[PDB]
Amino acid sequence: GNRRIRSVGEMAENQFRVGLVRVERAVKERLSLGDLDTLMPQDMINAKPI
Amino acid sequence: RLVIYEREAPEGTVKDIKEQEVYMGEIPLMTDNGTFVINGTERVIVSQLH
Amino acid sequence: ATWWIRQAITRSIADQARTIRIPVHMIETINKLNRISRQMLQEMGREPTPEELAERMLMPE
């Protein structure tokens, strides 16, 4: 009753979650200096990290 | 969806640019038989008990 | 003084932080490449071919 079973689906979600927080820090970093209309939600979010 | 609040709001948006589906990562896919192929090699993910 | 320190930091970082020291323009060249690879990453949805970036970059490519 105290041993819980995870399995692939949940596990991928957890790693992916970590991927999203480490992108979050970056995202804030860009919104720090931001110009209004030049950038869009691409120039910020990277791929490789996730 | 990128929202920008008029500076010193009551919250209302100056501009919202919807960047169509920025690409982040390629996540592996699970096979019809429940296996994964990471690099040319079938790999299975064992369920966890914690 | 900010300019001098910022100049000083960077000029040193460029110089010694690599086990194989490489000239500056080389570093700047490298930096230019990552930046492009970023846009081109999702812009292309896959990632640029080694020659994809070549026309974007000035040099012999």
Curated annotation (Swiss-Prot), chain A:
Signal peptide: none
PTM description: Acetylated on several lysine residues in the presence of glucose.
Biotechnological exploitation: Co-administration of salinamide and rifampicin or salinamide and myxopyronin suppresses the emergence of resistance to both antibiotics.
Family: Belongs to the RNA polymerase beta chain family.
Function text: DNA-dependent RNA polymerase (RNAP) catalyzes the transcription of DNA into RNA using the four ribonucleoside triphosphates as substrates. Resistance to the antibiotics salinamide A, salinamide B, rifampicin, streptolydigin, CBR703, myxopyronin, and lipiarmycin can result from mutations in this protein.
Oligomer status and interactors: The RNAP catalytic core consists of 2 alpha, 1 beta, 1 beta' and 1 omega subunit. When a sigma factor is associated with the core the holoenzyme is formed, which can initiate transcription. The rRNA transcription and antitermination complex (rrnTAC) consists of RNAP, NusA, NusB, NusE (rpsJ), NusG, SubB, ribosomal protein S4, DNA and precursor rRNA; S4 is more flexible than other subunits. In pull-down experiments interacts with CedA. (Microbial infection) Interacts (via flap domain) with Escherichia phage lambda antitermination protein Q; this interaction renders bacterial RNAP resistant to transcription pausing and allows it to read through termination signals.
Protein name (Swiss-Prot/TrEMBL): DNA-directed RNA polymerase subunit beta
Organism: Escherichia coli (strain K12)
From Swiss-Prot, chain C:
Cellular localization per UniProt: Cytoplasm
Positions of transmembrane segments: none
Family: Belongs to the sigma-70 factor family. RpoD/SigA subfamily.
Role, per record: Sigma factors are initiation factors that promote the attachment of RNA polymerase to specific initiation sites and are then released. This sigma factor is the primary sigma factor during exponential growth. Preferentially transcribes genes associated with fast growth, such as ribosomal operons, other protein-synthesis related genes, rRNA- and tRNA-encoding genes and prfB.
Domain notes: Contains 4 domains, connected by flexible linkers. In the active conformation, the domains are in an extended conformation, each making extensive interactions with the RNA polymerase catalytic core.
Quaternary structure, from the entry: Interacts transiently with the RNA polymerase catalytic core formed by RpoA, RpoB, RpoC and RpoZ (2 alpha, 1 beta, 1 beta' and 1 omega subunit) to form the RNA polymerase holoenzyme that can initiate transcription. Identified in a complex containing RpoD, the RNA polymerase subunits RpoA, RpoB and RpoZ, CRP and DNA. Interacts with Rsd; this prevents interaction with the RNA polymerase catalytic core and with promoter DNA, and as a consequence, promotes transcription from promoters that require alternative sigma factors.
Protein name: RNA polymerase sigma factor RpoD
Record organism: Escherichia coli (strain K12)
Lineage, uppermost ranks: Bacteria, Pseudomonadati, Pseudomonadota, Gammaproteobacteria, Enterobacterales
Name of the gene: rpoD
Entire protein: shown range: 431 to 491 of 613
